[PDB]
Ligand binder design. Structure first.
Ligand SMILES: CC1=C(CCOP(=O)(O)OP(=O)(O)O)SCN1Cc1cnc(C)nc1N
Ligand SMILES: CC1=C(CCOP(=O)(O)OP(=O)(O)O)SCN1Cc1cnc(C)nc1N
Ligand SMILES: [Ca+2]
Ligand SMILES: [Ca+2]
Lengths: 675, 675
């Protein structure tokens, strides 16, 4: 039949791509081609409009199987061709060895690191439910799309998927339909060696619906029926167990050897003949398969055409909501939204930056509907919920509504990170955030790195940033955390010192379209600074205190800026004139012009950095560094700062030593380099 | 009764400690005091010998509840007193706000970061099973101890605990007995808001045994009976559901407000009177409670006395095993074990450092019985299994034996990290390791940081360290990873360049007693270097190529050392004389004498670093840095190195620019500083 020919075409495109690269993963593509065929035939999508907001989404969580995804995209006429498949895993191609949303048309997210994609799917589905609750009206199903996820044994072993699956079950996300490739094989061999749990019983315990397909190597009728069944269960996410043979059809089917290396050439020949293909030919695309797939595309395009007319009618019936929706689909924030950001003067009271963050959110959430967010069981500590909003919960619970704006993630940092990526991936201008203690953002590093690689504008509200948190002690106090994320490409790590800097940090985070943000916020109160403004802090680094005859410049962040200003006064009494630079975001600063940056960190003067955590990175901006390169302590925070000499006198002593160390030396800006 | 008085004493010590600090967590201590009393009465331990190898272990995974643990330790006469309880959460005390094994007698591990302790308990139990299988003989139950873990809702939400619980069920770890504090309250309020899964059904799906105690606020008989029941189930770990009221007895019991802040003074008064204590008194310890607890200690000490005689008899009956066991309990490796480390010369073939690691393990595993380890589903890629060893599995599976030495962790990096911490915590000189790709060590950051804080000599075998892995692409290629871990206190991050350096890295990792190791290893082959040796590489950094008239020194690690040596030859043709320094471990180097370090990185010469990942940290050792501060690419590895100019000519160009940049300047070692 044409369906059988399409499945063979998919299988053989994937095998031939792996063969051409002499690299990659043929096993899961062979096993999942029937399911991929069946799912894509049920999906609504436009290969010529990858951003249609009511498309069904597909996520390949087992991203090593991407030769399968690329084959589907090619067959459906996305902006990906057989010539790109021939360049699988080759430098600069559109077919990298794991799918990247920035590079691959039709890849919703970046997968490959196991467990991430299913959590991203939870976030896409969460966003769709929130979006539909916000915009749909009687006779106007603006959003009614599904989220389809493929995942394997490896994703099911990774704890992040347990976190997200528990939460998705709690949230009753009935438009999520996941498919487990139940092939009993991973890299170390049989799953009997390490993965003998009853997966289905576990997913029932989360509140998921289950459909089992015992012959998923052939039974596309049953796979399609499983999708229909899942769509009728509107209050539970569904897991479809696809019992497959890894490498189905290969001489080596059902073995770990077919997981992750090219097939032998003789194996590929027998595959082709068993399925009616020419064993002398590679990258075959039978025209009848193209015709069949084209008919589905044409039907989907007529569905999108009708959706566009529905949207036009919605704009007439619901003028305000329609304009809001249009603005969001255009990727634009409300005009002048930033006028809602709080502004402070030096006469205002000292405030912790976690509380300043609460105040910002309180002002901007009512003005910017595409902001949603939550906390990992730290709502009253991170201060991430605006008073008067409702939680995102299924209404059946009585605890919230899908129109709600605040997510109770539970103690699930890693899944929160990957769910945020999925919310961003949904689109519609979502600007979403997640709170935890800064030290526990590290639990989510797998997802945070993917925010950066995927270019998603997510935001971590990362409070309790340092030894300033006090008594909880060294298990809670960041040392390495800023250095880790600042060393990751494409992460904006804001450590605001005061009210105006906190507003600048949020301006950056909400305006972002391609860069994730981490806002490192204090438990403890900090004064409003003389010289701060949103305007200057928006530059990432700026001269807070200018001193034309400076003997030294002190560059600092966050809680240490006020410390530097107090040290300047001690130094004055020692006959030393200091300037102060505040560096709330190193990435934003780095992006400024060379001339601007040199105006902040000029030649001809020693520069000392001060920040109560690792000194890594700081030599970009300073000649000497005063930091904290050991673990913290459990005690009242001011006593810890005193112990480690983060006091005005301790900073002054090190500044004076810095001045003395450079006497008789020629000093050029840390910004200079040889290449 | 005395038991009732003991429970009240525990509760009130914990409340009074929180009150004195005006900080900390009274709720879970109040709820778990009955269970703590019951469990400690079943445990075998010696407060005067915290290292008795056959003690039962206790782990408080919900580490915020540590006022409970400290109260138990005080009441049982560990080296912790009421005066220490009065200093709870005060700078420098023995009672920090979360328990630290380095500081608190009777704290087996460092907990507080949720989810870790239960996984540590899995590792303690895994080690006990391996240890017992190795040493026990008929009539000689050298090891027969249990592992008791308390955990709360937060630990159950964290994915790492799912990973470890799935694995522990697979491993049939019948001496593990965990207790869930089922109090339905977390920081964000009721668990109904985020955590509605059927926990018991999930644990059954992992293959755990379940006991439910529905009245754990009072029913110590049922808690004791649950322990007895768990001990009869020898092939399953057990979860005991303790249904408790958080803050039991408080006016605020059953609320989130009692989780994490001191009680009101009037509340503490009514607690004391309801339980027969003087509301005017704090830190009361009734002498009848001390007497009751002392009788249990005296009985336990007689048990240990008999164990010591059993061990003496074992040494006569099993002379070789007895001597091996004695050596391990003395904390000593076999005499001259390091003579088994492979040594190479420059005439030997090029080898990937992952393969060199395999060869080391092959030589040292047969010589050092206390080495065990595994991989997170990457055994044939990390090359972490020695041929001829058997896997650690329950014999009932047919797949291994508890005497085995190789652990199939599955795709569970985070739990592997925390399990390794538990294996190290067991003691008996275990030197244990875990393999994954370097980029996915990041999934385990929560546990890795705790290895450093806890001072455990665990080892990550972290292969596929860079863009050198090639086609899997940027989702797999480390950039920030070394910088992250090098910025963490107390992590030895070895990046060996060749065979001799790989042997030095293992010498360090296996000899370690207080410092975790990460070995960053290559996919790709590297040449044996002229000038390398175990002796010199053991210094962490050393002069590979000495050049008395150097115009520049190039400092490099790993795969980039050979690149530096090739660049030296290009530079010679440009009239520039270079030296080369290899820096296989920055931490070990930093610990050398100032004079040694200056002999490697002298004054008076520009120094350029080369390492194909982040430049963070490198200014400690260099004036200019050539690194990779952007994500990687999917292609054949040599093409990626060429794209980014990590070639002999690209290094030479940057070296020549460095020489030119310092012409006319006075240059001092990067090791110098102002303070
Ligand atoms: C173990 C591992 C794999 C086996 C998957 O096993 P699986 O899901 O059952 O896949 P399969 O049915 O055999 O094709 S892929 C490559 N990888 C390394 C790998 C490890 N950890 C993380 C976080 N991401 C990864 N990418
Ligand atoms: C959320 C959070 C807590 C609630 C526990 O909730 P729980 O286990 O149910 O404890 P309980 O019964 O209420 O006393 S503790 C402090 N913490 C922050 C916290 C967050 N993430 C990590 C990895 N470790 C932490 N330490
Ligand atoms: Ca599999
Ligand atoms: Ca709880």
């Amino acid at each position: 039949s044409v369906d059988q020919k399409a499945i063979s075409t998919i299988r053989l495109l994937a095998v031939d791509a792996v063969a051409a690269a002499n690299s990659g993963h043929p096993g899961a593509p062979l096993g999942l081609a029937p399911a991929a065929h069946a799912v894509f035939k049920k999906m609504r999508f436009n290969p010529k409009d990858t951003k249609w907001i009511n498309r069904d989404r597909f996520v390949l969580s087992n991203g090593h199987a991407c030769a399968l995804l690329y084959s589907m995209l090619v067959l459906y006429g996305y902006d990906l061709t057989v010539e790109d498949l021939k360049k699988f895993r080759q430098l600069g191609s559109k077919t990298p060895g794991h799918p990247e949303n920035t590079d691959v048309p039709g890849a919703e997210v970046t997968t490959g690191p196991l467990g991430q994609g299913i959590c991203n799917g939870v976030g896409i589905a969460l966003a769709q439910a929130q979006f539909a609750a916000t915009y749909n009206k009687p006779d106007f199903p603006i959003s009614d799309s599904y989220t389809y996820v493929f995942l394997g044994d490896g994703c099911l072993m990774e704890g992040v998927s347990s976190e997200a699956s528990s939460l998705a079950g709690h949230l009753q996300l009935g438009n999520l339909i996941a498919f487990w490739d139940d092939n009993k094989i991973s890299i170390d061999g049989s799953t009997e060696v390490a993965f003998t749990e009853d997966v289905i019983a576990r997913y029932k315990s989360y509140g998921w619906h289950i459909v089992e397909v015992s012959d998923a190597d052939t039974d596309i009728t049953a796979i399609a029926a499983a999708i229909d069944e899942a769509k009728k269960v509107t209050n539970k996410p569904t897991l479809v167990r696809l019992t497959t043979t890894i490498g189905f059809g290969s001489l080596a089917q059902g073995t770990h050897g077919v997981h992750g290396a090219p097939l032998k050439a003789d194996d590929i020949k027998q595959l082709k003949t068993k399925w009616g293909f020419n064993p002398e030919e590679s990258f075959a695309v039978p025209a009848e398969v193209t015709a069949s797939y084209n008919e589905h595309v044409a039907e989907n395009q007529k569905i999108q055409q009708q959706w566009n007319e529905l949207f036009a009618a919605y704009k007439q019936k619901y003028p305000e909501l329609g304009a809001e929706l249009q603005r969001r689909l255009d990727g634009k924030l409300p005009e002048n939204w930033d006028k809602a950001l709080p502004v402070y003067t030096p006469a205002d009271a000292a405030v912790a930056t976690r509380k300043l963050s609460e105040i910002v959110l309180s002002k901007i959430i009512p003005e910017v509907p595409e902001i949603i967010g939550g906390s990992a069981d730290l709502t009253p500590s991170n201060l991430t919920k605006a008073k008067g909003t409702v939680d995102f919960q299924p209404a059946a619970t009585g605890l919230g509504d899908y129109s709600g704006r605040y997510i109770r993630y539970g103690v699930r940092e890693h899944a929160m990170g990957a769910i945020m990526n999925g919310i961003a991936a949904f689109g519609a201008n979502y600007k979403n955030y997640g709170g935890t203690f800064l030290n526990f953002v590290s639990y989510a590093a797998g997802a945070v790195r993917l925010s950066a690689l995927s270019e998603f504008p997510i935001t971590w509200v990362a409070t309790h940033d340092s030894i300033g948190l006090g008594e909880d002690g060294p298990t809670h106090q960041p040392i390495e955390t800023l250095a880790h994320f600042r060393a990751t490409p494409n992460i904006s790590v804001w450590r605001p010192a005061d009210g105006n800097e906190t507003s600048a940090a949020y301006k950056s985070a909400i305006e972002s379209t391609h860069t994730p943000h981490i806002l490192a916020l204090t438990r403890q109160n900090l004064p409003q600074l003389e010289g701060s403004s949103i305007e200057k802090a928006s530059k990432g680094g700026y001269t807070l205190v200018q001193q034309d005859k400076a003997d030294i410049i002190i560059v600092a962040t966050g809680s240490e800026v006020s410390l530097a200003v107090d040290a300047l006064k001690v130094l004055e009494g020692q006959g030393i004139k200091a300037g102060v630079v505040s560096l709330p975001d190193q990435l934003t600063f780095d992006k400024q012009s060379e001339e601007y940056k040199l105006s902040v960190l000029p030649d001809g003067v020693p520069i000392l950095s001060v920040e109560v955590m690792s000194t890594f990175g700081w030599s970009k901006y300073s000649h000497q560094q005063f930091g904290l390169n050991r673990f913290g302590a459990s005690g009242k925070a001011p006593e810890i700062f005193k112990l480690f000499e983060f006091t005005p006198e301790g900073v002054a002593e090190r500044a004076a030593k810095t001045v003395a160390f450079y006497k008789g030396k020629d000093v050029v800006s840390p910004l200079r380099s040889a290449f």
